[PDB]
Amino acid sequence: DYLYFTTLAEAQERMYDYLAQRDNVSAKELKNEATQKFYRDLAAKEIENGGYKITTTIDQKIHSAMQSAVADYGYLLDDGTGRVEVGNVLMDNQTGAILGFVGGRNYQENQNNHAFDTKRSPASTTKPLLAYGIAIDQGLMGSETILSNYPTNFANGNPIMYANSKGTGMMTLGEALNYSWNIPAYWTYRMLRENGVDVKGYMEKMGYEIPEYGIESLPMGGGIEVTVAQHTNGYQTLANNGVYHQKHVISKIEAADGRVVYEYQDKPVQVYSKATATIMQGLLREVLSSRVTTTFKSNLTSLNPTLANADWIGKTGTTGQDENMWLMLSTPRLTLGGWIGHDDNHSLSQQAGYSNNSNYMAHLVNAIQQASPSIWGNERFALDPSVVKSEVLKSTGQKPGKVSVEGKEVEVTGSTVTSYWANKSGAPATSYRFAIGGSDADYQNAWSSIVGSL
Ligand SMILES: *C(=O)[C@@H](NC(=O)[C@H](C)NC(=O)CCCCCN=[N+]=[N-])[C@@H](C)O
Ligand SMILES: [Cl-]
Ligand SMILES: [Cl-]
Ligand SMILES: [Cl-]
Ligand SMILES: [Cl-]
Ligand SMILES: [Cl-]
Ligand SMILES: [Cl-]
Ligand SMILES: [Cl-]
Ligand SMILES: [Cl-]
Ligand SMILES: [Cl-]
Ligand SMILES: [Cl-]
Ligand SMILES: [Cl-]
Ligand SMILES: [Cl-]
Ligand SMILES: [Cl-]
Ligand SMILES: [Cl-]
Ligand SMILES: [Cl-]
Ligand SMILES: [Cl-]
Ligand SMILES: [Cl-]
Ligand SMILES: [Cl-]
Ligand SMILES: [Cl-]
Ligand SMILES: [Cl-]
Ligand SMILES: [Cl-]
Ligand SMILES: [Cl-]
Ligand SMILES: [Cl-]
Ligand SMILES: [Cl-]
Ligand SMILES: [Cl-]
């Protein structure tokens, strides 16, 4: 089944590297297609005939439970657009070890591996990693920062849409994330581009391959296509307080006599500051609790109320024509990535991600917990001590003070909130352009409202 061929494919690649090095084949010689073909064939025959011991990270009980879960509850994905395919990867946050996965609805009927082989746009699940997470990390926004959701156009003149909405007005980062509003994400990424932030540095530290970093819709999944395993690794990084561990299924390959052919080497990388990662955890907790873009917390509370009280965080994504839905879930211990879609890329139903995938993944998480009762853990995500707490105006997301509004020096006061920052000084004093993005006209409208409240 999926585990047999995924493991075999990975073992063959590791055996290929080992045999080429054993036989002293040069980097140049390895560029020869006929030489590569011979070493791939030799690697396959070595595994087939060689009596090697392959040690995997797979938890057999959990992986078996996940197979039974998709066999029993995969039909919950069928939304009237034909048989819906699925991929899931369960990853240990502290190691990057893959404990189990779902390759698809039924290997016997369709062998395509939707966990490791299929690449699709991760849509709005890109936003925490590539837009908001980097902006917080660079000290360009805090947890209660205000962003523009005022109407604006892409470079080609097309309006930035959210369902049938051309946008609203100013909103908090929390509102922007809970709803997955697009314009705030667009402005956040535009700010990173304008400031010359090395976004590629962050994304490549987590193993992402993105060909063009200038794509305006990168936060909404434009110009990015990922496997479920790779994208699970991005969420692993945020859940693990910003420390990436490279995903793996193979831990070790030994000859019969115990000679080590290959052994996974942990190379932990602090991709985001502990402050950034823990602030993002708090925001993604509210994405699930708000239930705006996913019913997951309602589904899970019914199936397993004790498990629903674990510290779940996560994020949804939907591609433009509903071809792909994503739900990424973490507790402190584990991350579970989930994709659904069609092999031929045709549209799912409008609510496929919101309801069907959420219900299926609640069943999958419950199946995992029944197989391994302690595996999700009862630990909480918590702000790192390095987080800076700033008292800011709810209205501006910046500290109270004086601003020039249409000539007149205005004393900006009102309701305050604690905003979490990952810099040294926390939130700046309120300035006229207090929000991420927005036009002159937007700011005239926003300030008119705020002044009206003093
Ligand atoms: C995150 O997943 C977000 N999804 C998107 O932004 C998605 C990639 N595209 C859209 O929702 C807008 C494209 C639709 C065509 C434009 N309308 N016209 N004409 C959120 C929204 O789920
Ligand atoms: Cl399998
Ligand atoms: Cl496979
Ligand atoms: Cl040999
Ligand atoms: Cl096991
Ligand atoms: Cl896609
Ligand atoms: Cl515009
Ligand atoms: Cl909200
Ligand atoms: Cl970049
Ligand atoms: Cl990638
Ligand atoms: Cl670039
Ligand atoms: Cl591996
Ligand atoms: Cl041997
Ligand atoms: Cl840190
Ligand atoms: Cl909740
Ligand atoms: Cl609900
Ligand atoms: Cl979404
Ligand atoms: Cl689509
Ligand atoms: Cl199909
Ligand atoms: Cl705890
Ligand atoms: Cl906390
Ligand atoms: Cl503080
Ligand atoms: Cl303060
Ligand atoms: Cl600072
Ligand atoms: Cl800005
Ligand atoms: Cl304007």
**In the chain, what are the domain boundaries?**
2-50, 65-249+265-371, 388-451
CA of 238 relative to ligand 5 center, distance in Å: 26
CA of 252 relative to ligand 12 center, distance in Å: 9
Give the chain's largest Cα–Cα span: 84
3-state DSSP call for residue 5?
helix
- DSSP bridge partners of 223: none
Atom of ligand 1 nearest to the CA of 222: 8
Residues 120 and 225 sit within 8 Å (Cβ to Cβ): yes
How far are the Cα atoms of 31, 44, 173, 291 from residue 39, in angstroms, in the given order? 12, 9, 52, 52
Annotated binding-site positions for Mg(2+): 207, 209
Residues 325 and 316 sit within 8 Å (Cβ to Cβ): yes
- Left, alpha or beta for 156 (phi > 0: left; psi -120 to 50: alpha)? alpha
CATH topology classification for 65-249+265-371: Beta-lactamase (3.40.710)
Q: Residue 141: which residues within 8 A CB-CB, separation 6 or more?
A: 132, 135, 147, 173, 188, 397, 436
Give me 259's structure tokens.
Answer: 């000679």
Residue recorded with tokens 């397993």: 304
CATH number corresponding to 388-451 = 3.40.50.12800
CATH topology classification for 2-50: Penicillin-binding protein 2a (Domain 2) (3.90.1310)
3-state DSSP call for residue 109?
coil
How far apart (Å, rounded) are the C-alpha atoms in residues 192 and 283?
Answer: 20
DSSP state of 152: -
Task: For 272-284, give one letter per residue: b (16+ CB within 10 A) or e.
Answer: bbbbbbbbbbbbb
CA atoms within 13 Å, Cβ hemisphere of 452 = 6
Task: Report the residue among 125, 220, 324 best suited for mutation to probe ligand 1: largest number of ligand atoms under 8 A from its CB.
Answer: 220
3-state DSSP call for residue 388?
strand
Closest to 433 (Cα-Cα) out of 136, 191, 197: 191
416-421 and 388-393 strand pairing: antiparallel
Structure obtained using: X-ray
Residue type, 281: Q
269-270 and 334-341 strand pairing: unpaired
Instruction: Verify whether ligand 1 is closer than 6 Å to residue 317 (CB atom).
Output: yes
